[PDB]
Amino acid sequence: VTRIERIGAHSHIRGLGLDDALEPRQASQGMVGQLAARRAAGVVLEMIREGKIAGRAVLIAGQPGTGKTAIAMGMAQALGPDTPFTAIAGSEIFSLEMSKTEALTQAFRRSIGVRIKEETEIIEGEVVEIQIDKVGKLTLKTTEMETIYDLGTKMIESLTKDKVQAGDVITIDKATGKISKLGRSFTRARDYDAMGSQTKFVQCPDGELQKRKEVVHTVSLHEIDVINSRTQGFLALFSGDTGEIKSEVREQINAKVAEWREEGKAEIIPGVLFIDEVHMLDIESFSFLNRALESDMAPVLIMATNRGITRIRGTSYQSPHGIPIDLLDRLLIVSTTPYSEKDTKQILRIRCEEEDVEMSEDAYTVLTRIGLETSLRYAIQLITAASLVCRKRKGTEVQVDDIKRVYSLFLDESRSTQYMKEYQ
Amino acid sequence: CSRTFITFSDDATFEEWFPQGRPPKVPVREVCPVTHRPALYRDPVTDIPYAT
Ligand SMILES: Nc1ncnc2c1ncn2[C@@H]1O[C@H](COP(=O)(O)OP(=O)(O)O)[C@@H](O)[C@H]1O
Numbered sequence: 001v002t003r004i005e006r007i008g009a010h011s012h013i014r015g016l017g018l019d020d021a022l023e024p025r026q027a028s029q030g031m032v033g034q035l036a037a038r039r040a041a042g043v044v045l046e047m048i049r050e051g052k053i054a055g056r057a058v059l060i061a062g063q064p065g066t067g068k069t070a071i072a073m074g075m076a077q078a079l080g081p082d083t084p085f086t087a088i089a090g091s092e093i094f095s096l097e098m099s100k101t102e103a104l105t106q107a108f109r110r111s112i113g114v115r116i117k118e119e120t121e122i123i124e125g126e127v128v129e130i131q132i133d134k135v136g137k138l139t140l141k142t143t144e145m146e147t148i149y150d151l152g153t154k155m156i157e158s159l160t161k162d163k164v165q166a167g168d169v170i171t172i173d174k175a176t177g178k179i180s181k182l183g184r185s186f187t188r189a190r191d192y193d194a195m196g197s198q199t200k201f202v203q204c205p206d207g208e209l210q211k212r213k214e215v216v217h218t219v220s221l222h223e224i225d226v227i228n229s230r231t232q233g234f235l236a237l238f239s240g241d242t243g244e245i246k247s248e249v250r251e252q253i254n255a256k257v258a259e260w261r262e263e264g265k266a267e268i269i270p271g272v273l274f275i276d277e278v279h280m281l282d283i284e285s286f287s288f289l290n291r292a293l294e295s296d297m298a299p300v301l302i303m304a305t306n307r308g309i310t311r312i313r314g315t316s317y318q319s320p321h322g323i324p325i326d327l328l329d330r331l332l333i334v335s336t337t338p339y340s341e342k343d344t345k346q347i348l349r350i351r352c353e354e355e356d357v358e359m360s361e362d363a364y365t366v367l368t369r370i371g372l373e374t375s376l377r378y379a380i381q382l383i384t385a386a387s388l389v390c391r392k393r394k395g396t397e398v399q400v401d402d403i404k405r406v407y408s409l410f411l412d413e414s415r416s417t418q419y420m421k422e423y424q
Numbered sequence: 425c426s427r428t429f430i431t432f433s434d435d436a437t438f439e440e441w442f443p444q445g446r447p448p449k450v451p452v453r454e455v456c457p458v459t460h461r462p463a464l465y466r467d468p469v470t471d472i473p474y475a476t
Contacts, residue, residue: 128468139468145465145467145474146467146468146469147464147465147466147467147468148465148466148467148468149465210464
């Protein structure tokens with residue numbers, strides 16, 4: 001059976017391969033080599049799990065194919081679903097309905113988790129009879145007890161607007177919303193022809209009628225969208241408002257979350273914001289981050305740029321990493337070193353093990369020698385390519401000849417630029 | 425000075441409003457003969473105010 005998330009580029013990264021003392025192992029769970037960069041990743045991951053401070057930023061820099069996104073995915077996988085890890089690209093902010101600043105604001109607020117716990121007394125039971133004359137009575141039922149309730153004006157109005165019939169397992173809370181939870185217990189045989197799209201006959205509840213329902217759910221600090229309109233939950237599934245007013249975003253929601261945390265009804269859990277390829281950001285977003293990192297409850301940023309001394313978009317000034325120095329000053333730069341003949345073959349072997357490709361030692365050697373001359377991801381793709389070419393060859397073990405067949409079939413950037421002599 | 429002298433005294437329907445209810449509270453703890461606890465609901469089949 002095939003799942004939605006089959007093996008991809010970084011599927012082999014099943015967490016960050018460190019020790020109890022953050023010491024990087026040579027061969028570990030997915031990650032390989034890059035000892036210093038991986039130890040720095042573990043340090044920032046511990047700083048994350050701590051969450052005592054805000055406004056931290058680490059920038060992983062290195063040549064393309066050194067494992068920046070690999071370390072990012074390792075940190076993401078090591079940071080369980082408990083805390084949010086919002087991984088956005090460097091171009092997911094250039095929106096048409098949102099400005100280049102509200103996008104970063106929403107991304108920040110999305111990386112701050114909040115575990116809400118709610119308690120409520122609930123009445124649940126099968127409705128036996130509803131008499132009405134206005135005032136009336138209601139006979140709820142459960143295998144443990146059967147009761148009587150006198151209904152008031154609002155109760156009767158809600159009951160009539162919900163059209164609850166006999167046998168329906170009604171559910172009533174204080175400050176009655178009157179959730180018609182389940183369908184009918186009895187009065188079956190409607191399946192003879194049809195059932196309502198909302199009918200879920202499942203049997204009548206057991207146990208006591210009244211109960212205390214404690215419900216815990218993890219939301220994000222972006223819940224301002226859940227207030228920014230009349231029907232708010234709807235705007236949470238699509239683009240939504242162009243931008244929620246600051247006069248509410250930055251004061252009202254924050255104060256209410258503080259009150260919740262003081263009363264003990266909720267608790268904030270900061271997360272991580274991984275902005276990949278941040279070199280595309282304009283100087284405006286960088287000047288915004290300059291102050292955003294100064295705020296009180298900002299998440300920790302993880303940037304991954306592969307550009308050296310290059311021009312900053314929107315301007316003509318060259319700078320390291322292609323971003324402003326006033327922003328680089330507030331970061332913490334880690335460096336990833338290029339892989340060697342020893343590490344390239346190791347990660348290639350791990351990638352072969354991923355899809356369970358049995359490769360010979362000569363094939364491993366030749367593929368490593370190829371990838372050390374052209375590119376790493378090129379040799380990674382050659383793994384699956386040769387695997388398929390040999391599976392069609394009625395083979396079981398990929399060999400040097402099948403690897404060279406693919407090497408000749410599929411070109412790389414270098415050989416393609418070389419063969420581009422015709423100039424159409 | 426400025427005063428108000430609303431009048432409806434030509435009929436008794438007005439004069440009947442003030443003494444409308446003037447009734448006190450007489451829902452009391454409906455102790456049940458099972459546990460002697462804050463009785464919760466009257467059983468529609470036994471008409472007894474049971475708690476547990
Ligand atoms: N240290 C490592 N451990 C495991 N796999 C690695 C490692 N370094 C590179 N790889 C493999 O090489 C591939 C390319 O690395 P990638 O993360 O794309 O580099 P970059 O981060 O520079 O874009 C990844 O998909 C990964 O599977």
